[PDB]
Symmetry: C3
Subunit: 125 residues, 3 copies
């Protein structure tokens, strides 16, 4: 029943340094068009981006494919449900891959301390 | 089937600072009566509290309840079995919630370094 | 169904300090023959060893640390498949224990930042 498992850890100060070197580049690689617009106006953009990077990198690793099946970051996004829990929403080729794998349930968890954000994703049939 | 997933990370030095500001308040909030009695005489109270917080916060996220404070920290506790695996024991509304969700198994794992403790919890039917 | 869950976090500088004190001792203890051969010529050997330690401690916790004696980190070999995905290959008593437990699938995920490596392992029937 478990189709894949993924984890990530992000050092928030490293993302801050990346933004200072190359501006919006990291945000546009990692965020969807929708999420990019929220980062542009967020009050804690570095922490927002660090936590999203953690979730989306964990989700990409959970899907677990090489370049042949690229779950590009620009075809899925994270949102919070009514309880504040992170949830994944997929479209385009990202959603097509989930259908091909027979993904029936996705589990997402995220935590952050001052200096690090960590996330785990499990996809299941 | 996986019913929920939760993870947490705790910066031990942040817990140390919390204790310096407000004494036993954090311990009284996170620990059950039984766990409080061990903390009172523990040789590493800060680390004991940091690791229990990580496990119990991970566990609350795995239950992922919309019941306002449905998995209250004062209604469950952690112990180790003969294999060294951390285990959850629930009473009151916490146990009622577990029964309503149909929880048949609870998997808990915990790790700590000098500066951080982390934990992941999966509940399953 | 899930047979076990384990997580670990490794402070890389702690591994680096161990190596400065006792050289190859740690690597020779925890790594399998295959992993030892990579450690000897790796361009980032300390980071290699720290990440392997994270997987081996996570996998040990998943199987159950106090189960038996004669289990050892060098029997939890990690390798990369043709996609670069980390995978477990078991030898000796670890392989026997897996067969006794009815392990049908093993899921491994690993992530590293500059100061920490973390891993989670799930074994399943
Ligand atoms: Na921190
Ligand atoms: Na306190
Ligand atoms: Na204890
Ligand atoms: Na115990
Ligand atoms: Na348990
Ligand atoms: Na700390
Ligand atoms: Na540490
Ligand atoms: Na050594
Ligand atoms: Na780091």
């Amino acid at each position: 029943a478990i189709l894949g498992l993924g984890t990530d850890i992000v050092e928030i100060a490293r993302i801050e340094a990346v933004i200072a070197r190359s501006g919006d580049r990291l945000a546009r690689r990692v965020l969807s068009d929708n999420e990019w617009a929220i980062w542009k106006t967020h009050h804690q953009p570095v922490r927002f981006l660090a936590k999203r990077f953690a979730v989306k990198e964990a989700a990409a690793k959970a899907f677990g494919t090489g370049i042949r099946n690229g779950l590009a970051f620009n075809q899925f996004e994270v949102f919070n449900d009514e309880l504040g829990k992170p949830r994944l929403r997929l479209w385009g080729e990202a959603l097509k891959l989930a259908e091909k794998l027979g993904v029936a349930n996705m589990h997402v968890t995220l935590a952050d301390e001052r200096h690090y954000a960590c996330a785990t994703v499990i996809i299941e049939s």
